[PDB]
Amino acid sequence: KRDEKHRHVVNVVLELPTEISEATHPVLATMLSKYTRMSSLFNDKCAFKLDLLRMVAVSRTRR
Amino acid sequence: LTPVTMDVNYFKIPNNPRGRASCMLAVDPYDTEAATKAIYDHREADAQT
Amino acid sequence: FVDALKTLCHPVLHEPAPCLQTFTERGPPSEPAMQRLLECRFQQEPMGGAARRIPHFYRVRREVPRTVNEMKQDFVVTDFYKVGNITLYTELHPFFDFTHCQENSETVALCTPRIVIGNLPDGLAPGPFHELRTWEIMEHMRLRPPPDYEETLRLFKTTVTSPNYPELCYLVDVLVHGNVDAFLLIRTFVARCIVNMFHTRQLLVFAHSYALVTLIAEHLADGALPPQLLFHYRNLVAVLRLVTRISALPGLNNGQLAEEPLSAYVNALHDHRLWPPFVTHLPRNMEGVQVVADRQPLNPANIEARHHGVSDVPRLGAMDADEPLFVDDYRATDDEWTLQKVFYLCLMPAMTNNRACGLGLNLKTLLVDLFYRPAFLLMPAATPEDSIAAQRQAVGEMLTELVEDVATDAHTPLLQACRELFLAVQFVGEHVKVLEVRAPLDHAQRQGLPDFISRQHVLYNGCCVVTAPKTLIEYSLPVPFHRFYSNPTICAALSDDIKRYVTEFPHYHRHDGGFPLPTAFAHEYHNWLRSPFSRYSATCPNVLHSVMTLAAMLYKISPVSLVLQTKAHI
Amino acid sequence: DYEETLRLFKTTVTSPNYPELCYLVDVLVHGNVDAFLLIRTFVARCIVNMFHTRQLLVFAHSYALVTLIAEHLADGALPPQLLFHYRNLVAVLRLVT
Amino acid sequence: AHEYHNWLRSPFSRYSATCPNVLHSVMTLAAMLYKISPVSLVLQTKAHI
Amino acid sequence: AARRIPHFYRVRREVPRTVNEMKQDFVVTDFYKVGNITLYTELHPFFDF
Amino acid sequence: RISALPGLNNGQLAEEPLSAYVNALHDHRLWPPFVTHLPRNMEGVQVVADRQPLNPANIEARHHGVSDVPRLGAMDADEPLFVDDYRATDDEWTLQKV
Amino acid sequence: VDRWIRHAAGVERPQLLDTETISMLTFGSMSERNAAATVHGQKAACELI
Amino acid sequence: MSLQFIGLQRRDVVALVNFLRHLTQKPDVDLEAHPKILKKCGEKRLHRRTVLFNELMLWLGYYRELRFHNPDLSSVLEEFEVRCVAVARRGYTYPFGDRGKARDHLAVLDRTEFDTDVRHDAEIVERALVSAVILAKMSVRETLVTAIGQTEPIAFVHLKDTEVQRIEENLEGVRRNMFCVKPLDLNLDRHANTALVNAVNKLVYTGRLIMNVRRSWEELERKCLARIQERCKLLVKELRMCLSFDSNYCRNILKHAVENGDSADTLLELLIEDFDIYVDSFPQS
Amino acid sequence: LSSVLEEFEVRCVAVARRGYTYPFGDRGKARDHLAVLDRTEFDTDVRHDAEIVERALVSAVILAKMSVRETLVTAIGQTEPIAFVHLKDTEVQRIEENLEGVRRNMFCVKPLDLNLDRHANTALVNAVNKLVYTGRLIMNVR
């Protein structure tokens, strides 16, 4: 069911390496819902990539 | 006025305070276009300075 | 002049109509030799993505005729009165500036008032006469011997003029956007770049931007830096405070009219209507100003709605696209907004001699081609750093060309250094854009051309730049949008079309106002600044006094400004 | 000559850099001689720790501190130049009276 | 707002807004601080200040 | 008054300045000009009125 | 910023820059005694090494870094002369004179 | 070049237009060129390099 | 817009939804009017961060319909200028002892307008109370206060005391549920009293209505921002105590200033739409 | 039409009462639209109501631009575009869905939860937004 959609996001859009997985890094699994509910701008690639990129920058911080 | 205005010339010698000395005594009598050319025109410089 | 205030302040002096109407009745001059002056296409254009559309204007081989003010400026003060001058009719009123714009199938004149006192041509206000007036304004301030702040300004002959200027400063200056929170994260690392480059280049880092020095002089004042290097930054803020303390001062008197302070009618450096060429946040007051962007104004507040620091997919796709524009806050206090005018608009052109010019960057393809690496994609931080060659393989090529010698200490591995810049990735600002500005003249000056509105352009999301990166060159976006910050030299190294325009017309190589503005920006005639400013900036020294005299050229010619200047016997 | 201290004085009091803790200190001590007598090791530890890094001297804000820094902290654990600064300021105040 | 009755007045702080920082301002503030009282004028007069 | 001071600043009303401040603004030679509006304020030097 | 008059210079006479008519340090026609390249403006220049002008393209060719036996055996030969890209601009050519 | 010199020198016989046709009753030759203002006498100067 | 909450039982959440759907319809519209509803949030009953978060949702949720039902001065004030015109047209007819005690108030009586901002309404209707109410005393030759510095009294004149007891109960109901005023049962007009006073009494009644509505409205909104500022400061200071990504993301949601409820209205959709991501941030039970 | 017809002139007169106190650059640009703003009422026939409402779209919408002073349809002979003034795009895409939803079932409307009023906006704009929205409602009904 949803596994084909999350695979469509992780691969066709995010272009994540196979070693990365939704069961590996938690922030992607938390973001699978927000990535799924949206439908616009799938033709863009840098958007979701920069989103997960900056969100990983929020994932670890001392201040 | 312009602050750069010359004083050794324009202010020491008497002249028209208009900044462009002119006289109907110098302009040709009974004239208009060349007479106004003597005053309000700039391409032809006035006498004095 | 105090006795003459009963005459000079009278309204009849300030109305264009008696002069402009007779000037229109005279018509264009009939003499063919003066017809070369007549050409000038002041065509307005929409500001919708024009920052990326700029090179297309440079693709054409056509020469741009010089503006009538640009032609009048060339003469020596003694030649200005001579018959050889052909611009004598151009300025029938010192407060104003008449010209014959060539509208299509037309030749109607375009009057526009001068605003700041330095708009006058050098045949009116030569530099050597004017700096002596700056000594008088300094004399009234009881500060004739300037404080010995010059020792840090001598570094500006090096640090900002240097071809070798580091490329990391452009990356930090972009990512911070002037926000305090970016310094709150990078403060443990940003000082390391300064002590390291000063250890190598013997010049302070981040001289280019007011937003960085203003907060490093405060938020990083605690530790992080050796006392002397921090002393230079607080010394620079002390120099900017010296500029605002010479700018005007209500030390004569304060008060206000309508609503604006009297200590603002006398100088454009105070009132909010003038804007710095660069900006990080909007001024807290915007009344009397409309920020047009496309053909329709972006002025209404409904468009702005930033929510910075939060993941926003539609917002991340909104970059490159113009509207909706947004800003986090009207962060600029009138004091910080005043020093923001002091920096990019006065100090930097005075020290670079109008050399350095800013440029934008395409953050999407930049950060995707830069970051997104697996070492960034997977960085757990509980509570291949072994061989240095392997961590160089992990950081990629660009990080090895950007981080190592420029920043990290030998104690700090390149991975630990790049993680610090990786913390700043969360501060994703918008792509570079040009915000057109239209501010109608204040009522003290509005009577001259009541329908007139001052026209401006500001480089939002822009950054001060000297020498563009040769590693990030692929994403560089040169923007010679203004008389200040306009460098044909470095701009030729970026987009090839500007190098084509230079090789075809070498004489535009000059750093002054002789380099044409794009017709999208070729509204210099409506600009607050005029030819004598930046043209004097090409020849100004670097003592400190030139930064003072540029502010002295900034005095407004408003009749109320004539009153207060008269009160001090200036 | 006394102006050489005054350059450091204008450097220290005008600066935004100036630390927050001193305002709590002057409120806490209230100028009593016994307070300096029992906290002299701490205030001297602050002046020596901070003068090296802040460059500008600390605790210049109030007469109540500097008046007794000359009398108590001068016994030791301070550079001679700093006691020359505090003795300079006292000599200036005596020069004014 | 009862500063109008205060010993110190308007000129002092305005003088201190632009006062010299060499050393002289500390001296000249006391020089402006001398009293107008007739006994102050008497002792001051003998020294020819 | 040490505690209630901000409440005085909460009002947006402006507070007009005293004559002692307004009189000072004039330059030395400018003070004797007819344009001074505070000439009657200072009938005595020691005593303001 | 002394050999020319940037504040006085403006526009251009003919296709050539007006500053080249003011000083020999800026015009393409003059060359420094030592030159490792060639000026961008060949218009008024006609180089010669033996007899006839070197205008035709057969006179010039170069190819660094891939080894060229005919060049190595013709290093003594006066012609054809070999030259790389005209990377120098009139500004870099001016410093090349200075 | 020769076209550019005419602007920098300011000299041009056609620029006078010889007052063709439209002259008001005055001489059409205008005694060749003729200055409109003349407070002083005829000019006279030459130079030797 | 579906509501979201952590530890509350479904009956309490539905009780809060029904508390909102009929909120203006409920008697006594104030959070203080029902203190037990604040206990329904589960303070002390739930974890501290969960209590401050759910309470902050209760304040934004109480603010959701202040943006909806809004002040409605339209139909009320439309008859206000009409009754003021009736006080004027009746007022010119009646001679007084001298016009100098009336001509200034009579001039303000007809120069009344309405500034575009709602906040200037306090300058509007109150000036009519300075004018027409004194005219009723001038009809009766009552002794208005003469002392300097003494504010002029503002109250109903020559109404029967039981009628004052009823009309004040109507204004007290306007002080409570302002959105449903309901027309008065007992007409102010009386044949025994002159109509010159009674028309002023109806003008005072509409003036007490617009004053009680706008003042209770401004008191509710200013208290809302005053309490939302407390919930935001206490939540940021509490989330700061333990660093975590799910907590720091909520702190990024809270970086925005409490000032102005328009940005808070964007803050509601910004928060509820992303409610699922940070459910782990709040321990319960 | 009853309750819809009643409050339309109320909001229209509310826009008028908000507009009397604000000076413009000239009354003549506005006084004609202000004259149409008040004299209009409601004919009993349903078909005339669109003519009653469309003139208000010609009026207050231009006045909303006069509240901000902006370029309008200066060209002669150009029909004036009519749309909600000074509102965020998400409110527009939602309100149009509510308008098409009224078209799907005019007998049951149920107003959208979002509120046209905006504290950042001038109240002169928000009253025009409610007025144009009620005009879109009656236009969708007829």
Given a contact cutoff of 8 angstroms between Cβ atoms, the answer to whether C143 and C247 are in contact is: no
- CA D96, E3, E9, E12 torsion-angle sign: positive
In chain A, residues with a C-beta closer than 8 Å to the C-beta of I245 are 27, 58-61
Task: Compute the distance between CA of residue J53 and CA of residue J139 in angstroms, rounded to an integer.
Answer: 8
* Cβ-Cβ contacts under 8 Å for I81 (sequence gap 6 or more): I112
Q: What are phi and psi of J30, to 5 degrees?
A: -110, -30
CA I34 to chain centre: 17
From residue A48, alpha-carbon distances to C311, C312, C374, C536, J74 in Å are 10, 9, 16, 49, 44
Quote the CA–CA distance of A50 and C430 in Å, as a whole number: 13
How many CA atoms lie within 13 Å of C455's alpha carbon, on the beta-carbon side?
A: 17
Residue I44, number of CB atoms within 10 A of its CB: 8
* Residue type (1 letter), C320: D
Cβ-defined contact of I256 to C307 (cutoff 8 Å): yes
Q: C271 vs B37, C263, C517, D77, I59, CA distance in Å? A: 46, 8, 26, 53, 40
- Token readout for C110 is 């375009």
Using a CB–CB cutoff of 8 Å, tell me whether A34 touches chain I: yes
- How many Cα atoms within 13 Å fall on the side-chain side of residue C274? 27
Distances, alpha carbon C37 to alpha carbons C91, C120, C281, H7, in Å: 14, 19, 40, 11
* Assigned token pair, C76: 């020596």
Taking the C-alpha atoms of residue J80 and residue J58, their distance in angstroms, rounded to an integer, is 7
Q: What 3-state class would DSSP assign to H30?
A: coil
Hey, what's the torsion of the CAs at D69, D71, D77, D79, to 10 degrees? 70
* CA distance linking residue C292 with residue C302, whole number of Å: 14
Backbone phi, psi, residue F3, to 5°? -95, -35
Whether F48 and chain C come into contact, CB under 8 Å, resolves to no
Tokens linked to G78: 């006066």
The residue whose two tokens read 């975590």 is I244
In 3-state terms, what secondary structure has residue C325? coil
Place of tokens 């251009």: G12
Query: How would you classify the pairing of strands C453-460 and C278-279?
Result: parallel
Cis peptide, bond prior to residue G80, ω within 30 of zero: yes
| CB within 8 Å of C125: residues ≥ 6 apart | B3, C117, C118, C532, C553
CA distance C544 to C350: 8
Chain J: residue whose CA lies nearest to I115: J21
Distances (CA, A) of F30 to C251, C568, E9, I256: 15, 9, 21, 53
Other CB atoms within 10 Å distance of the CB of residue F10: 6
User: From CA C513, how far away is CA C357, in angstroms rounded?
Assistant: 13
Q: Are I262 and J126 in contact (CB under 8 A)?
A: no
Helix (H, G, I), strand (E, B) or coil at I17: helix
User: What pairing do the DSSP bridges indicate for beta strands C359-361 and C278-279?
Assistant: unpaired
Residue C299 CB coordination number (10 Å): 19
The sheet with strand C278-279 has its strands ordered as C278-279, C453-460, C433-440
Chain F interface includes C253 (CB < 8 A):
yes
Of D94, D91, D93, D88, give the one whose Cα is nearest residue D8: D88
- At B38, is the secondary structure helix, strand, or coil? coil
Could you tell me how many residues make up chain D? 97
Tell me which amino acid residue J78 is: Q
Tokens describing residue D10: 């204008």
Nearest CA to A53 out of C326, I113, C167, C367 is that of C367
Tell whether C53 lies on the interface with G, counting CB pairs under 8 A: no
Q: How far apart are CA C401 and CA C395, in angstroms?
A: 10
Solved using: cryo-EM
Find tokens 């300004």 and name the residue. Answer: C153
CB contact under 8 A, E22 and D3: yes
Residue of E nearest to C138 (CA): E18
What are φ and ψ of residue A30, in 5° steps? -70, -30
Residue of C543, B1, F48 lying closest to E5 (CA atoms): F48
Distance CA D58, CA D47 (A): 6
- In terms of CA atoms, which chain B residue is nearest residue C33? B43
Residue C460: beta bridge partners? Answer: C279, C433
Question: With the CA atoms of H15, H21, H27 and H33 taken in that order, what torsion angle do they form, in degrees rounded to the nearest 10?
Answer: 10
Q: Comparing C-alpha atoms, which of C113, C135, C133 is closest to residue C125?
A: C133
How buried is C340 (Cβ within 10 angstroms: 0-12 exposed, 13-18 middle, 19+ buried)?
Answer: buried
At residue I217, φ and ψ (nearest 5 deg) are -70, -45
Structure tokens at C431: 């792509």
**Is I135 within 8 Å of I91 (Cβ atoms)?**
yes
Distances (CA, A) of I31 to C137, I24, I218: 62, 12, 15
Q: Is E9 near chain F, with CB under 8 Å? A: yes
Verify cis geometry, omega within 30 degrees of 0, for the bond prior to I27.
no
The count of other CB atoms within 10 Å of the CB of residue B35 is 18
Q: Which two tokens stand for residue H49?
A: 């390099």
For residue G57, give every residue at least 6 positions away whose Cβ sits within 8 Å of its Cβ, in sequence order, or none: none
By CB atoms closer than 10 A (0-12, 13-18, 19+), residue F15 is exposed
F18 and E9 within 8 Å at the Cβ level: the answer is: no
Residues with Cβ within 8 Å of residue I76, at least 6 apart in sequence: I181, I206, I209, I210, I213
Count of alpha carbons within 13 Å of J50, Cβ hemisphere only? 5
**DSSP code of residue A12:** I
Q: Over I235-253, what HEC string results?
A: HHHHHCCCCCHHHHHHHHH
* Chain C interface with B: residues with Cβ < 8 Å: 31, 77-78, 80, 83, 88-89, 123-126, 129
As a whole number of angstroms, the distance between CA B35 and CA B22 comes to 10
The strand pair at C260-261 and C256-257 is best described as antiparallel
Structure tokens at D70: 């000359």
Q: Is E39 on the interface with C (CB under 8 A)?
A: no
What is the C-alpha separation between C278 and C357, in angstroms, rounded? 11
Burial of residue G25 (number of CB atoms within 10 Å: 0-12, 13-18, 19+): middle
User: CA of C335 to nearest chain E CA: how many angstroms apart?
Assistant: 17
Among J43, J45, J33, J44, CA closest to J131: J33
Q: What is the C-alpha R_g of chain C?
A: 25
DSSP state string for J89-104: HHHHHHHHHHHHHHHH
Q: For residue A24, give both structure tokens.
A: 């590996």
CB contact residues (below 8 A), chain I span 248-277, against chain C: 249, 252-253, 255-257, 263, 266, 270
Degrees (nearest 5) of the Cα angle J95, J98, J101?
A: 155
Inter-chain CB proximity C141 and E19 less than 8 Å: no
The residue type at J61? V
| Chains H and J touch, using 3 or more CB pairs below 8 Å | no
DSSP 3-state assignment of I174?
helix
**Residue C353 bridge partners (DSSP):** none
Q: How far is CA G18 from the centre of its chain?
A: 19
DSSP letter string, I81-130? HHHHHHHHHHHHHS--S-GGGTHHHHHHHHS----SSGGGHHHHHHHHHH
Q: Which residue, chain included where needed, has tokens 């920096």?
A: C343
For residue C566, give Cα distances in angstroms to C137, C143, C570, J84.
12, 20, 6, 52
Beta-carbon-side half-sphere exposure of residue C521 (alpha carbons within 13 Å): 25
- Cα–Cα distance for residue pair H46/C157, rounded to 1 Å: 49
The 3-state DSSP class for residue G8 equals: coil
CA–centroid distance for C321 within its chain:
24
Residue closest to C211 by CA, chosen among C355, C342, C304: C342
Q: Give the C-alpha separation, C488 to C476, whole Å.
A: 15
Beta bridge partners of C478: C359
Amino acid at D51: F
Could you tell me how many residues make up chain C? 570
Contact C568/F33, CB-based, under 8 Å? no
Tokens representing I180? 């449903």
Q: How many Å apart are CA C94 and CA C119, to the nearest integer?
A: 9
Hey, what's the torsion of the CAs at J94, J100, J103, J107, to 10 degrees?
-20
Three-class SS state of J49: helix
- The residue among I46, H43, F33 whose CA lies nearest residue C566 is F33
DSSP, residue by residue, C142-176: T--S--S-HHHHHHHHHHTT-TT--SHHHHHHHHH
Answer yes or no: are the C-beta atoms of D47 and D73 closer than 8 Å: yes
C137 Cβ contact list (under 8 Å, min separation 6): C246, C548, C552, C570
CA atoms within 13 Å, Cβ hemisphere of C65: 13
CA distance readout (Å), C5 to C343, C554, C567:
34, 21, 9
Yes or no, beta carbons of C569 and F25 under 8 Å apart: no
Q: Is residue F33 less than 8 Å (CB to CB) from chain C?
A: yes
Beta bridge partners of C456: C437
Dist. CA C175–CA C256, nearest whole Å:
39
Segment 71-100 of chain C within 8 Å of chain G by CB: 71, 74
- Residue I126 CA: distances (Å) to CA of C86, I111, I133, I157, J74: 68, 13, 10, 16, 43
Partners of chain B (3+ Cβ pairs below 8 A): C, H
DSSP structural state of residue C332: B
For residues D3 and C563, what is the distance between their CA atoms, to the nearest angstrom? 40
Distances (CA, A) of C405 to C206, C277, I97: 16, 32, 96
CA distance I182 to chain C (A): 37
Which residues sit opposite C457 in a β-bridge? C436
CB C483 within 8 A of CB C461: no
Quick one: residue C451, left, alpha or beta (phi over 0 = left, psi -120 to 50 = alpha)? alpha
I50 vs I41: CA distance, rounded Å: 10
What single-letter amino acid sits at I59? W
Residue indicated by tokens 């938690």? A26
Beta bridge partners of C555: C267
Note whether C504 and C492 are within 8 A (CB): no
Question: Using an 8 Å Cβ cutoff, are G9 and C66 in contact?
Answer: no
Cα C277 from Cα C247, distance rounded (Å): 19
* CA-CA-CA-CA dihedral for C538, C544, C545, C551, to nearest 10: 80
Angle at C373 between CA C372 and CA C377, to 5 degrees: 75
